[PDB]
Design a protein around this ligand. Structure first.
Ligand SMILES: Cc1ncc(COP(=O)(O)O)c(C=O)c1O
Ligand SMILES: Cc1ncc(COP(=O)(O)O)c(C=O)c1O
Ligand SMILES: [Cl-]
Lengths: 320, 322
């Protein structure tokens, strides 16, 4: 079922790797300058580094079409407000520059980043309103949390037992952030236990999310995905809209840990890879150990949606 | 006659001298990829996982009147922190020490805030085993920073026990491993400002006190010191103040500190490398005890700073040799 998109994608990557464009390996916007991604540098005094004082968002370009960029911009502006950050670049400026950098790079399948940091001033010495916040933009070749090869059979995960999710009353998980202390411990625990990915609990016997992805349990034809303690993922939104069209019931609510061990299918969903089936959990098969039919149908709907003119636009039909 | 003059008179003179210096490193110096760079020109690659996933640990010793204080304790904790996160410094312990002293002498700074950082580097631990990652080391020496300045120490600072945020629990992020994932502390600083206070004190969300944004907390009641054990960094400043407390005959306990005790204590100290002993005289808009900097705070303050000359716990940067 992967050939549906990956045959065409592999052709586009071949063309990009053959390109002599100095931005084909990626492009960064830093202080009004476009720089090749691997030469791009930020000041070490940026509080985005010295206190991870930032928020970010990651839309994708697929076959030269941005997917749900307005949803990512909406969530980014919301995230900025929650942390009392104000982007020096307008929402409309960010959109214009992200499209320009995509065209300028020639990258047709892109992992895109918009970052706002506190700047050089910290919020102990200064009110947030007295801080001049920084904006960084990056466009790079599309990244896969789960690659084609792994998606064909599904990946492996564990419910972490050495680490639990940062609670929202400490750090708000609806505000996309790079304070991955728990997720990083999770990835190490997964490798220790011979699995690719962690699923973190809330420390109260419910599932939350993983290292850069939401979790969807499928049982008896119904989708179950955590409400609290997680990022409100754009991939999750897309997959649930596809589920609605196909007549699959879903609920965004508490997901008790027990349900992970009794379900038929598990999906991980994220911008960086899309729909990512999981067929091993804690060393045991998920259901029959096969990529399930509902996973396949949602995978197809998700990718088909990247041509939907209501949800996407082509990078050349765009005008500032 | 103010008790703060004991150190600030001499320090205000030394800064004046430094602000007159033409040395291009007098504003600070960074080690980046085997090069010394002026601090305000120093840059790191945007793809450093120290940035893209705050995948790092750090430590902060200080230089005072040209003497490093307890640098070996900071190096000990840094190596422990690196091991916990499966980071290996590309610079040995001995190289970090040599370079930190070199950068201090080269800068001419007599009162410095020092920073040793190790990040994951350009590879992340999803695609790669941690042993496959070539980790980066960054060093910085800059003019000494004050979480609480001279003016505030004279009458004491203001704090609140946070009610809009709690501390990241140890089973999410290990607080004994010094890290820059300040999501909770940053919320705390914003809440403090909203409530007309300088500093936050975060609870563990289970009715105990933890630490604040870059400092440990010590309560003092009926001559006894109480400081949280769990949910906090094991501060070198806290260690020093407790040694000064043991030597002066003040009993102390490192254990759970229930929130209630904050409202019933006689004195409150915040302790950190970036400011030292920092008395707190207002809590949730009300006086701490009699609203004055207390006698035990002053005694511990004096002992802490006096110990920056002790030859067993400090060394002069000029007398050091690689
Ligand atoms: C913690 C976390 N959860 C979930 C996601 C996926 O959400 P989205 O589909 O909006 O990328 C990400 C994104 O990388 C993430 O960092
Ligand atoms: C969270 C936290 N606790 C405690 C401290 C104090 O540790 P030390 O006294 O060793 O500097 C700091 C210093 O920055 C800190 O960030
Ligand atoms: Cl719910």
């Amino acid at each position: 079922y992967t050939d549906h998109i990956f045959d065409d994608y592999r052709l586009r990557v071949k063309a990009l790797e053959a390109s002599d464009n100095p931005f084909a390996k990626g492009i960064a916007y830093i202080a009004g300058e476009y720089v090749p991604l691997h030469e791009a540098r930020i000041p070490i005094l940026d509080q985005g580094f010295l206190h991870s004082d930032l928020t970010y968002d990651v839309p994708a370009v697929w076959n030269g079409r941005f997917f749900r960029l307005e949803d990512h911009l909406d969530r980014f502006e919301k995230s900025c407000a929650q942390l009392r950050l104000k982007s020096p670049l307008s929402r409309e400026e960010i959109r214009d520059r992200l499209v320009e950098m995509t065209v300028k790079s020639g990258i047709r399948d892109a992992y895109v980043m918009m970052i706002v940091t506190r700047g050089l001033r910290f919020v102990r010495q200064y009110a947030p309103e007295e801080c001049d916040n920084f904006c960084y933009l990056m466009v790079m070749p599309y990244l896969w949390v789960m690659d084609e090869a792994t998606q064909k059979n599904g990946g492996s995960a564990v419910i972490t037992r050495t680490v639990r999710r940062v609670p929202p009353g400490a750090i708000d998980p609806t505000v996309k952030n790079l304070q991955w202390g728990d997720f990083t411990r999770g990835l190490m625990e997964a490798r220790d236990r011979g699995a690719m990915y962690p699923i973190l609990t809330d420390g109260d016997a419910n599932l939350t999310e993983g290292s850069g992805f939401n979790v969807i349990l499928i049982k008896d034809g119904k989708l179950y995905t955590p409400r609290k303690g997680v990022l409100e993922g754009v991939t999750r939104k897309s997959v649930l809209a596809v589920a609605e069209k196909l007549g699959y019931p879903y609920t965004i609510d508490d997901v008790p840990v027990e349900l992970a061990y009794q379900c038929d299918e598990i999906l991980f969903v994220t911008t960086a890879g899309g729909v990512m089936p999981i067929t091993t959990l804690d060393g045991q098969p998920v259901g029959d150990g096969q990529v399930g039919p509902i996973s396949k149908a949602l995978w197809k709907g998700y990718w088909d949606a990247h041509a939907d003119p209501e949800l996407s636009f082509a990078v050349e039909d765009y005008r500032a």
